[PDB]
Structure 1
Amino acid sequence: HHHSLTAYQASSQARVDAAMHTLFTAPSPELARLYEAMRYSVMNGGKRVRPLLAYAACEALGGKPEQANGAACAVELIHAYSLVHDDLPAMDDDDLRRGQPTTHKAFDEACAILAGDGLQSLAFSALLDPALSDASAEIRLRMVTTLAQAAGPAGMVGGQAIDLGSVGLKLDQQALEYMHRHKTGALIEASVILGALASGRAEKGELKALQTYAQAIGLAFQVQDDILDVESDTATPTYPALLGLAAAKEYALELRDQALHALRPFDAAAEPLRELARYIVER
């Protein structure tokens, strides 16, 4: 039972969905299909957890959540574009995502490539759109810089590349964690740091804490994902294989605890971040 988190997710998804709407109107008829493809790729069925994170970090520091609209859109658009390319035939070659045809299936491969390309750019536009933030010049430099680092070849793209190059190879835990830290950790950290920055009230100490929280939940998610695949398996390169199931479950709990410890400096305004940490390993 996680009532307030369900309500927080709902408000988070509504706010970022309405914010994004303004981004996806093609400027002309010739551009309509590309914009439709991008829209399709964002209507992917996700829970907008990265926007959730942006908004929650903003409010933890005292900002109005809408101050983080630019951040929330930007991280969701980065996340969207990553999934579209990830599904491509040359990559994971998936026909479905969350029950629906993937973008290259609903459209075609060439459209899907570009839709992903278009979405990465729009993510940066969104971050700087004055309708989406009121942030000050240097804060927004911090934010833009951050997003590019987190999404690029030393971040999420790097993580995808590590994934490809790990096909075959026998990974240990340190290598598995390195790969996850890049593939999904980076953008999760960016989510919380961008949200915090967006409040205008962010101090060095507070960002450190939030980065610690974010690193912890990013790993907890991947550990629990593996645990759930195993448990669903005994229903009808992974953490359980490396550690054994029992030990994997404890690891996930220790990470949830490290995440909650990181949030000790904050007041009740940080409760959604705390409830998410709990949910990730409870789910």
Structure 2
Amino acid sequence: SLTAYQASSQARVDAAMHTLFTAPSPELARLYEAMRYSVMNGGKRVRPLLAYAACEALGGKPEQANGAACAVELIHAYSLVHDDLPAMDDDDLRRGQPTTHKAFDEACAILAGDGLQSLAFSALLDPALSDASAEIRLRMVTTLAQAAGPAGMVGGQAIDLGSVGLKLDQQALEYMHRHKTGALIEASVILGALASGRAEKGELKALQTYAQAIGLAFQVQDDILDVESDTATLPTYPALLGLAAAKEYALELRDQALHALRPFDAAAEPLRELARYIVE
């Protein structure tokens, strides 16, 4: 089941990340603690799940993707630490608990995020977290840097900033989302597939399509749930499309993701289950 697969994914990446967060000296203890706080918050580890699942879909042992899984989670975690800062989203809480700058301070949170990004690259190339060839590994870091950087995730965040008080159309909203969250979701599946040592051109293309579709499905579904909650109590896909059409679109995106996985056997079931889960 997806519940079982999420639990195994979470346990595996959490255990793998453990070693990364021991300070080499007492002087550095607080920094490493702030990084741990930013990561070890009981997160659902969807990005590790995607990396492990992509690896297994191609016949790899999941631990082959430990470096991939750690890297994408560390990039994700750093992005949230910075996003929560007063200069950005200005959030005092995340999932009910104080954000890193509140539990520590702003300077510490800035540095914790900066350190987490560097650690993500270290994890990708750590021989204990994988065994892929130098060349496969080359591809991995190239992909992560492109996905995480100013043409990917950071670019998405900058688009989000630059769109405050603009009336975006569907194309613009999707473009933003594809950067802000799609890029790192795609990196998760591509890195895990690469980690198997068995990935062919066609399969990577298929996984890219899958990843982009679930990336958008998450965003569309989030908007639908917001409207349904507001209806219950009182630029979005429902505003642009109408709620009925937005609902149809979320199902369409799920179906696009499932269709992209047609070249894979039963070993891809966790990826199929995740796509279904998004709209359940």
| TM-score bin (small chain) | over 0.9
For 1:101-126, what per-residue CA distance to the aligned partner results, in whole angstroms no more than 9, with x for missing partners?
Answer: 00000000000000000000000000
In the alignment, the residues of structure 2 paired with residue 274 and residue 120 of structure 1 have an alpha-carbon distance, to the nearest angstrom, of 30
Q: CA deviation at 1:45?
A: 3.1
1:229-240 to 2 correspondences below 5 Å: 229-236=226-233, 237-240=235-238
Task: Spell out, residue by residue over 1:37-57, the C-alpha distance to the aligned partner (whole angstroms, 9 max, x if none).
Answer: 000000233200000000000
How many Å separate the matches in 1 of 2:47 and 2:279?
17
State the superposition RMSD in angstroms: 0.4
Residues 16-40 of structure 1: per-residue CA shift (max 9 Å, x gap): 0000001000000000000000000
**Does the 8 Å contact 1:45/1:98 carry over to 2?**
no
Q: Distance in 1 between matches of 2:41 and 2:184?
A: 18
What's the CA shift for 1:207? 0.2
| Whole-angstrom CA distance in 1 between matches of 2:83 and 2:227 | 23
How many aligned positions are there?
279
TM-score, with length taken from structure 1: 0.98
For 2:18 and 2:40, locate their aligned partners in 1 and report how far apart those are by CA, in whole Å: 11
Shift of 1:67: 0.1
- 2: CA distance between counterparts of 1:53 and 1:128? 19
Question: In the alignment, which residue of structure 1 is the partner of 2:54?
Answer: 57
Unaligned runs of 5+ in 1: none
For 2:20, what is the secondary structure of its paired residue? Answer: coil
Q: Structure 1 stretch 41-50 or stretch 63-72: which is displaced more?
A: 41-50
Identity %: 100
Q: Distance in 2 between matches of 1:43 and 1:10?
A: 15
Following superposition, the deviation at residue 186 of structure 1 comes to 0.1
Separation of aligned partners in 1, 2:28 and 2:164: 38
Report runs of 4+ in structure 1 exceeding 6 Å deviation.
none
- Which whole-Å CA distance do the structure 1 matches of 2:243 and 2:117 have between them? 37
Which residue of 2 is the match for residue 5 of structure 1?
Answer: 2
Shift of 1:234: 1.0
Structure 1, 41-50 or 133-142: larger mean CA deviation: 41-50
Cα deviations by residue, 1:60-100 (Å, 9 ceiling, x for unpaired) = 00000000000000000000000000000000000000000
Secondary structure of the residue aligned to 2:47 is: helix
Contact 1:44 1:97 in 2 (8 A): no
Distance of 1:183 and 1:154 partners within structure 2 = 10
**Which shifted more, 230-239 or 8-17?**
230-239
